[PDB]
Structure 1
Amino acid sequence: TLLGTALRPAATRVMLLGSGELGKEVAIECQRLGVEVIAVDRYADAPAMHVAHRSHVINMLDGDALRRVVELEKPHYIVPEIEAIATDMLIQLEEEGLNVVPCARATKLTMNREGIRRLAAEELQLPTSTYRFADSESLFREAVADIGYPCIVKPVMSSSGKGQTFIRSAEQLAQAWKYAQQGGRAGRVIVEGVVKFDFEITLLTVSAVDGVHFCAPVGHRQEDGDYRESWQPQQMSPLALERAQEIARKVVLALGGYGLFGVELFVCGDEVIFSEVSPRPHDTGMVTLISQDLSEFALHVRAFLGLPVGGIRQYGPAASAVILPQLTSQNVTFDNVQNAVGADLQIRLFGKPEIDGSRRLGVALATAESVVDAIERAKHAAGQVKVQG
């Protein structure tokens, strides 16, 4: 493996499609290796753009627009950071010789729940919640009837819980369906039976030249479609961990290509159930910014560049807690920062240009002798931040 010098003729060029907080760290890790970074998104001054050599704002769902920016910048690697990309064009491009991380098929399969769900459950025979898809209200209604209550309805093309409803009674059916319509390419939906898990985890799995490597299990807590806190390591029985690893390995290998994947799993004792997978760094993995020698961002980079992982070091109990304020502003400020960092406590503020409602603008990170204590220290610190606009 050979790397060039960013900005020079033989530069190794990486193009990020999506410039949120996740890509910002991928960008930093690229920059740490003198890798040239082109950050693209649907809006200007996106996080990853702050730390990139050059940025472009285009409609990433427009295959022609994508083709255009790619032809323009001639990246060696196209690193999708969000789901909402013109995957069909990535496949084209990949065929035309471009390297899509981890691979274009991985991106296509995961951007639509139907693809990844059917692959995992039907082709890989992995355990998942029960599910049905529906593309009309009536079909949706039949689906619910067959699935039972409670059940969760989600659009097949969504993230961070947009257009999703936890359905407890037929009473919600109409609202649920409309709402699932508002969320979505606005479309088809998935109706899943509710898994009553003991806890849920994210198994950050790196597929690299030297094999499949696993980060220690990251536990996470979700609320109202948003991850609130994550921690590592999440304790699991030996049997559960081994089962989780098995599932994760099968998934990443099936999707193909080098990179770090966020394998979302539900744990019921010693039993593990597959939920979904990010074929790229995962939000919950932001805890690895404090908990490992190589963050999930650093690992994604390492793997995609074709270099060996070797191993991953875990420094002990740690957690992340989101900074998710709710306001409307185009000039956001953060005060009381002196009460948000200190010993074994840090924060990250994304640089997002504005907010109009709820938005993840930063994250607090902490370490401690237990995840319980780390979680509290991180939440507390996130809380101390006085967000104003």
Structure 2
Amino acid sequence: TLLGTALRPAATRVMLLGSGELGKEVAIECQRLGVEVIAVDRYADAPAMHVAHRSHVINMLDGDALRRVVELEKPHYIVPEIEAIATDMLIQLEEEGLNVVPCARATKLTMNREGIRRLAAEELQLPTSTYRFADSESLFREAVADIGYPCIVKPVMSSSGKGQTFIRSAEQLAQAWKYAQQGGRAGRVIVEGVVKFDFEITLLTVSAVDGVHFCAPVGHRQEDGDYRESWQPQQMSPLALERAQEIARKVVLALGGYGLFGVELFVCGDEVIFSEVSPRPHDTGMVTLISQDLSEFALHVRAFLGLPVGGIRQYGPAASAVILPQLTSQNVTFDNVQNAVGADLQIRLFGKPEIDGSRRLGVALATAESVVDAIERAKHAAGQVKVQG
């Protein structure tokens, strides 16, 4: 592994496709290695752009635009932060010699539930929820019938729960089907049975030159399509853990390429069920900013740059809790910060330029003697911040 000096002729260049808070930490980790960072997004002053050498605002869904910026910048690495990109163009660029992290195929299978679902369930022969795909309401109706209640319906092109519906009753069908055609692209869906699990975890799995290494399991609480709190390590049976790792390894190896992956699983006793996987750092993993020697962002960079991980140290019970206010403003200020920091307690404020509704503006990070106390410490701190408009 040879690294140049950022801004110099031999500089090593990383292009970030998506400049949110996750991308912001990757940018930081690149900067720490004197790696040149070019932050791209669909709006100005995105968080990662604050810490990049330079940036561009483009429609990442537009492959011609993608090609143009890439060609312009000639990056050594293309690192997507989100699903919403012209992956077809990534495939092309990769085919043309670009290094897409972790690999372009990985980004495509994952942006489509069908792709990934089939791979895991069928190909990989892995445990997942019951499901069915449908191209028409009739089929939709048909499928919901085959799956039963309650059930979940999601566009094969959905995230943050966008265009999805929890179904317990036939009465929702008109709206459900409509919600589904609504989000994502705006027309195919998936109908999954509902899993009754003890808890959900994110198994942050890094695939690098020295193989696959795992972070301790991250548990989390989802609400209204948003994670609220995350903690580590989530208590699980040795057997359960063992099964989760097997699943994670099979999946990452199957997707291919080096990087950090967020493997979403469900746990019921010693039983583990595959849900889905992010081919990049996961929001829940923000707890690793205080819980490990190497954060999920640092692991991602280490891996993609072709460097060995060796090991991951975990510093005891830890937690993250989001700062998710809801208002409309283009000049947000944060008060009472002094009551959100202290021993074993930190906060991050993203730099987002504006808000117009519910948006993640920061996160609180805490460690404690117990996971339960870590959670409370983090929640309480997030709650002390007064978000003004």
Unaligned 5+ residue runs, structure 1?
none
Q: Paired residue for 1:43? A: 43
Question: CA-atom RMSD, angstroms?
Answer: 0.6
Aligned with 1:120: secondary structure? helix
Aligned with 1:37: secondary structure? strand
Once the 2 structures are TM-superposed, how far is the Cα of residue 214 of structure 1 from its aligned partner? 0.2
| Aligned-partner Cα distance in 1 for 2:125–2:60 | 33
Post-superposition CA distance 1:77-96 (Å, at most 9, x none): 00011000111110100010
| 2:10 aligned with 1:10 | yes
Aligned with 1:309: secondary structure? coil
Q: Which moved more, 1:91-100 or 1:149-158?
A: 149-158
Q: Paired residue for 1:113? A: 113
| Aligned-partner Cα distance in 2 for 1:340–1:14 | 34
Post-superposition CA distance 1:249-294 (Å, at most 9, x none): 0000000000000000000100000000000000000000000000
Post-superposition CA distance 1:181-227 (Å, at most 9, x none): 22111121111101010000000000000000000000011011110
Q: Which moved more, 1:134-143 or 1:270-279?
A: 134-143
Once the 2 structures are TM-superposed, how far is the Cα of residue 153 of structure 1 from its aligned partner? 0.9
Once the 2 structures are TM-superposed, how far is the Cα of residue 29 of structure 1 from its aligned partner? 0.2
Aligned with 2:39: secondary structure? strand
| 2:280 aligned with 1:280 | yes
Once the 2 structures are TM-superposed, how far is the Cα of residue 157 of structure 1 from its aligned partner? 1.2
Q: Paired residue for 2:382? A: 382
Once the 2 structures are TM-superposed, how far is the Cα of residue 47 of structure 1 from its aligned partner? 0.6
Once the 2 structures are TM-superposed, how far is the Cα of residue 237 of structure 1 from its aligned partner? 0.3
Once the 2 structures are TM-superposed, how far is the Cα of residue 75 of structure 1 from its aligned partner? 0.1
| Aligned-partner Cα distance in 1 for 2:187–2:230 | 32
Post-superposition CA distance 1:90-142 (Å, at most 9, x none): 01000100000000000000011111111111111111001111222221111
| Aligned-partner Cα distance in 1 for 2:167–2:350 | 34
Post-superposition CA distance 1:313-361 (Å, at most 9, x none): 1000000001111111111111111111111111111111111110111
Unaligned 5+ residue runs, structure 2?
none
| Aligned-partner Cα distance in 2 for 1:134–1:353 | 39
| Aligned-partner Cα distance in 1 for 2:295–2:239 | 26
| Aligned-partner Cα distance in 2 for 1:182–1:339 | 42
| Aligned-partner Cα distance in 1 for 2:70–2:224 | 36
| Aligned-partner Cα distance in 2 for 1:51–1:344 | 25
Aligned with 1:100: secondary structure? coil
Once the 2 structures are TM-superposed, how far is the Cα of residue 155 of structure 1 from its aligned partner? 1.2
Q: Paired residue for 1:135? A: 135
Post-superposition CA distance 1:41-91 (Å, at most 9, x none): 111110100000010011101111100000000000000110001111101
Once the 2 structures are TM-superposed, how far is the Cα of residue 362 of structure 1 from its aligned partner? 0.7
| Aligned-partner Cα distance in 1 for 2:245–2:380 | 32
Aligned with 1:99: secondary structure? coil
Once the 2 structures are TM-superposed, how far is the Cα of residue 163 of structure 1 from its aligned partner? 1.2
Aligned with 2:245: secondary structure? helix
Once the 2 structures are TM-superposed, how far is the Cα of residue 16 of structure 1 from its aligned partner? 0.5
| Aligned-partner Cα distance in 1 for 2:358–2:174 | 25
| Aligned-partner Cα distance in 2 for 1:150–1:279 | 29
Aligned with 1:221: secondary structure? strand
Once the 2 structures are TM-superposed, how far is the Cα of residue 3 of structure 1 from its aligned partner? 0.2
TM-score w.r.t. the length of structure 2 is: 0.99
Q: Paired residue for 2:89? A: 89
| Aligned-partner Cα distance in 2 for 1:195–1:317 | 27
| Aligned-partner Cα distance in 2 for 1:213–1:121 | 23
Aligned with 2:181: secondary structure? helix
| Aligned-partner Cα distance in 2 for 1:202–1:274 | 10
| Aligned-partner Cα distance in 2 for 1:304–1:242 | 26
TM-score w.r.t. the length of structure 1 is: 0.99
| Aligned-partner Cα distance in 1 for 2:310–2:78 | 24
Aligned with 1:241: secondary structure? helix
| Aligned-partner Cα distance in 2 for 1:164–1:22 | 24
Q: Paired residue for 1:191? A: 191
Q: Which moved more, 1:322-331 or 1:295-304?
A: 322-331
